[PDB]
From a paper:
We found a previously uncharacterized protein classified as a glycosyltransferase encoded in the Actinobacillus minor NM305 genome and named the gene product A. minor glucoside-glucosyltransferase (AmGGT). The AmGGT protein consists of two lobe domains, which are typically found in the GT-B fold proteins.
The crystal structure of the AmGGT protein was determined to the resolution of 1.85 Å. Although the AmGGT protein was mixed with isomaltose (as an acceptor), no density corresponding to the isomaltose molecule was present in the electron density map, presumably due to the weak affinity of isomaltose for the AmGGT protein. A substrate-binding groove is formed at the interface between the two lobe domains. Although the asymmetric unit contained one molecule of the AmGGT protein, the gel-filtration chromatography suggested that the AmGGT protein exists as a homodimer in solution. A dimeric structure was generated according to the 2-fold rotational crystal lattice symmetry. No protein degradation was observed with the E135A-S185A mutant protein. In contrast, at 37 °C, the catalytic activity of the WT protein increased, but that of the E135A-S185A mutant protein decreased. These results suggest that the homodimeric structure of the AmGGT protein contributes to its thermal stability under physiological temperature conditions in the porcine host. In the AmGGT structure, the side chain of Tyr16 protrudes into the substrate-binding groove, narrowing the acceptor-binding site. This bulged structure likely prevents the binding of glycopeptide substrates, such as the Glc1-peptide, to the acceptor-binding site.
Numbering used by the authors:
A (entry chain A), B (entry chain A): 4 to 342
The structure:
């Protein structure tokens, strides 16, 4: 009789927030008990932002949960760690979806290593290695997010070349690259380039579905979701991989994208021009087919649901003993006083 | 009877603005004629911000200059290029101090190559190669800025270790690095780390003068002035070089800094710890001496003044013929209508 509680303090916003809702949904679908605990900002705009099928409990100082319950913490929100250090009750899992933001939740690896974390769930084997590089020695698990089914190819134009890119990361580097592209491209046809930085996620899917090429400005990725979305959409991916230490991941390779290294703006533009000429000649890259096959095999919902069940059941099968409590004991939560 | 006109539209702000004032000062000191032309914002706060020894002329639609005069344009401020394309009078030099911002002034290399630019002055041989990589074929020259004399070593503490760094660039990467440093450093002593991002330039000099180590977050540099300031101050420089294509510059090398590559946060922290232990043991790096010698020999005011005279005289000795004007003819400037 264990519930997994996922703390939120705001409307779901970041990629990471939406993944956590998918964790909750998969858990509840497959016989587990999972809920949002909304720690603060208990106002209608926030409350109403959680879909109907997501259970929400409100934090109130003095409420009681069960000693056996599990908190699934972000790598951020330091205050969740300091509060829960006030009791011996509960288990703690960290869902670290952003290894380079580990500094937003905990002071150092030492503090993580001394905390009663039972497991760290990560998006990728790369993330595991990055946290271990940082000095973290806690047990780790991988559950990669999935690409929603509405990312898929649509018919692409046979008379104009459509390129899309995001400036969410590397805003200034996209301007540099596009300057090289304008400087080096000598083909006849005008290029159709669209910045999708501020599109809604379904609009991103729509734009990619019709795009021939996705110019990648990925940066310090865990998995590389934008690129995988592009691959799901049948786009040729050209540009930054998101991994300076590219050798520490095995999702992206020479056969599913034209990757460049930091600062390689000329090579980036040259690869774009090569990709443009392939589309102009109606001989699109075989890297598109490889990218499609990658997403189909590894990054859709069925496999995610399998991995959620596997990983969370393994955690439930391997919990530390409760110190100072029995299962079913009620425990007051009064560790936070928010505005 | 040639005057060099340096356009400004605001109080001197950026590094580049202050370098241009030093160009003006050197030119006027050594027998040339150079002035600011203040294009707009002719209000006391702006007017008063120019030092007394900097000549300032105000743009007014309908004013006259001499056909032979030379405009020294920034790589930015597109409107200066479009305006001056309305006449055959004048010569144009570009002082491109920021090659990665070339996109802020001109659409492409093609547009630069077709413009009547007589010479592009740059901060470094690296910058020359970068612009040429981009497809620019105009003649180029190098005048490196100098480090002001108030950057120099002061006595440094023998009992605490002082590190300084800037977040002007790579704001988020400094947090990542400091997280690795906190995670990996196991020495006794508490570190004295100061962020100087918002210090005045003289305060930067003061802080560096007392600092043992400068942690470098340089990014897409032309020359690497912050690092050179640190070297002038007797700091050990550790971290990012500012040059992804490090092989295309020859200022920084293994003997004057502990440079790391992109994403190498662990190696960065490890080099910092090595530098900390050297200071703790009173055996500071010989790279400090090499850095001092570099600045003394190449980056002080006397050499800058030599290079200004050399480069600008070479330009005056090699001007294109005036088309459609004689020397001494008056030419109306009415190409801009600013707020």
């Amino acid at each position: 009789n264990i519930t997994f509680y996922f703390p939120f303090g705001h409307v779901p916003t970041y990629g990471g927030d939406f993944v956590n809702l998918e964790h909750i949904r998969a858990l509840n679908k497959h016989g587990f008990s999972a809920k949002v605990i909304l720690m603060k900002n208990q106002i209608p705009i926030v409350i109403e932002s959680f879909p109907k099928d997501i259970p929400v409990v409100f934090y109130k100082p003095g409420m009681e949960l069960n000693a056996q319950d599990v908190f699934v913490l972000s790598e951020g929100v330091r205050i969740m760690y300091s509060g829960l250090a006030q009791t011996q009750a509960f288990r703690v899992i960290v869902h670290n979806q952003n290894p380079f933001y580990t500094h937003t939740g905990m002071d150092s690896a030492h503090d993580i290593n001394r905390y009663r974390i039972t497991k760290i769930i990560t998006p990728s084997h790369y993330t595991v290695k990055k946290l271990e590089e940082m000095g973290i020695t806690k047990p780790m698990a991988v559950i990669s997010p999935y690409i929603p089914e509405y990312f898929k190819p649509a018919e692409k134009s046979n008379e104009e070349i459509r390129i899309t890119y995001s400036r969410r990361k590397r805003e200034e580097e996209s301007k540099i690259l596009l300057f090289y592209l304008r400087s080096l491209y000598r083909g006849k046809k005008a290029l159709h380039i669209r910045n999708l930085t501020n599109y809604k996620r379904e609009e991103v899917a729509e734009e990619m579905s019709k795009a021939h090429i996705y110019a990648s400005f990925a940066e310090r990725e865990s998995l590389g979701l934008m690129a995988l979305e592009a691959m799901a959409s049948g786009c040729h991916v050209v540009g930054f991989s998101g991994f300076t230490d590219f050798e520490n991941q095995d999702v992206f390779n020479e056969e599913n994208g034209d990757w460049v290294k930091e600062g390689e703006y000329k090579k980036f533009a040259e690869k774009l021009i090569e990709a443009i000429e392939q589309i102009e000649n109606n001989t699109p890259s075989p890297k598109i087919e490889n990218g499609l096959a990658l997403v189909n095999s590894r990054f859709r919902q069925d496999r995610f649901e399998q991995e959620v069940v596997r990983v969370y059941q393994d955690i439930l099968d391997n919990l530390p003993p409760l110190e100072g409590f029995n299962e079913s004991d009620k425990v007051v939560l009064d560790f936070w006083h928010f505005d």
